[PDB]
Structure 1
Amino acid sequence: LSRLDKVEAEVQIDRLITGRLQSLQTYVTQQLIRAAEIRASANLAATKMSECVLGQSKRVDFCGKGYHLMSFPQSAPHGVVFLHVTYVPAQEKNFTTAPAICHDGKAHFPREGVFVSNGTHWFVTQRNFYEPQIITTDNTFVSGNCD
C-alpha cells in the first residue's frame, strides 16, 4: 500500500487474499480430519473405561493380554492410561486324557473339568489349574451307553 495506489494495488491484494484464504481452508480441513480421528480414539477410550474399569470383560485381548481381572485408570496430558491386571499360566505338565469312563456299562462325563491320568490312576481337574480329585458321582453325570 505504501508503494502502490489503489487501482494497481488491488491486483496484488487479491492475489495475497486468495493465497491466504487457500492456506486457511487447507488448515481447517486437516484439523477436521484430525478431529474425526481423535473422536474415534476417545470413543474407544470411553468404551474401554466402561467395560474394563467398571466391570470384568470376557472379550479376548480387549482389556489386556490374558484372562482379565481388573483395571485402574490414570490421567495424562490429553490422554488416559490403563493398567490391565491379567492372569497368565506359567508351568504346564503333559498328561494322558480320555473323554469318558465306562464303569457300570454306562458312560460317565465330567460336570466340570476334564478326565486326567498320570499313567496309573485317573482324576478330574479344572481346566486352568491342576487339582486332582478322586472320581465321584458328584463329579460325573450319566448319559447313554459305552458303544
Structure 2
Amino acid sequence: VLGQSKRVDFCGKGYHLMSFPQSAPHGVVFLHVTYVPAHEKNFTTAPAICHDGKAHFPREGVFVSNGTHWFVTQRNFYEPQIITTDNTFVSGNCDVVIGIVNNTVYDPLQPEL
C-alpha cells in the first residue's frame, strides 16, 4: 500500500502496480492491482548485432526480427524501434559472441553531417 513491491507474489499475482486496503471484521482485505502480459507473439531474436566489425547490444531492450527486418524493443511490451547508435552500445568485435547476426546500425548524425 505505501509503496510498490518487487517481491514476487507478495502483493498479488503479476507485476505489482499498487494496492488498496479495506477494513473487515477482525481482519483486513487487500485489493491488489497488477499488470499482466496478455497477447504474446513469436519473434526471432539475437544476442547481438554485428556492424562495421563491431558487436552491438541493446541498452534497455531485446533485438527482434519479424522475419525480414531487425528492431529493438522493450521486454514486457512489443514496441519495435529502428536499431541505432542511440539505443545500442558497442563492446568488442563480432568474433566472440555466439549467435551474432549481421544488420545495419543507424547513426542519426550521419545524414545531418
Structure 1 length as normaliser, TM-score?
A: 0.63
Gaps of 5+ in 1: 1-52
Question: Per-residue CA shift, 1:1-53, capped at 9, x if unaligned?
Answer: xxxxxxxxxxxxxxxxxxxxxxxxxxxxxxxxxxxxxxxxxxxxxxxxxxxx0
Structure number having the greater strand percentage = 2
SS of residue matched to 1:71: strand
Q: Distance in 2 between matches of 1:109 and 1:124?
A: 10
Q: Which residue of 2 aligns with 1:78?
A: 26
Q: Distance in 2 between matches of 1:102 and 1:71?
A: 45
Quick check: 1:104 aligned with 2:45? no
Q: Distance in 2 between matches of 1:125 and 1:107?
A: 18
Q: Distance in 1 between matches of 2:18 and 2:85?
A: 36
Question: Per-residue CA shift, 1:41-77, capped at 9, x if unaligned?
Answer: xxxxxxxxxxxx0000000000000000000000011
Measured after TM superposition, the shift of residue 119 of structure 1 is 0.3
Quick check: 1:143 aligned with 2:91? yes
Structure 1's consecutive aligned runs of 4 or more residues displaced over 4 angstroms after TM superposition are none
Measured after TM superposition, the shift of residue 94 of structure 1 is 0.3
Larger relative CO (CA 8 A, sep 6+): 1 or 2?
Answer: 2
Gaps of 5+ in 2: 95-113
Measured after TM superposition, the shift of residue 137 of structure 1 is 0.4
Identity across matched positions, percent? 99
Quick check: 1:65 aligned with 2:22? no
Q: Distance in 2 between matches of 1:75 and 1:98?
A: 50
Measured after TM superposition, the shift of residue 80 of structure 1 is 0.4
Q: Distance in 2 between matches of 1:140 and 1:76?
A: 51
Structure 2 length as normaliser, TM-score?
A: 0.82
Question: Per-residue CA shift, 1:64-115, capped at 9, x if unaligned?
Answer: 0000000000001100000000000111000100111111101000101000
Report the structure number with the largest CA radius of gyration.
1
Measured after TM superposition, the shift of residue 132 of structure 1 is 0.6
Measured after TM superposition, the shift of residue 140 of structure 1 is 0.7
Q: Distance in 2 between matches of 1:141 and 1:90?
A: 30
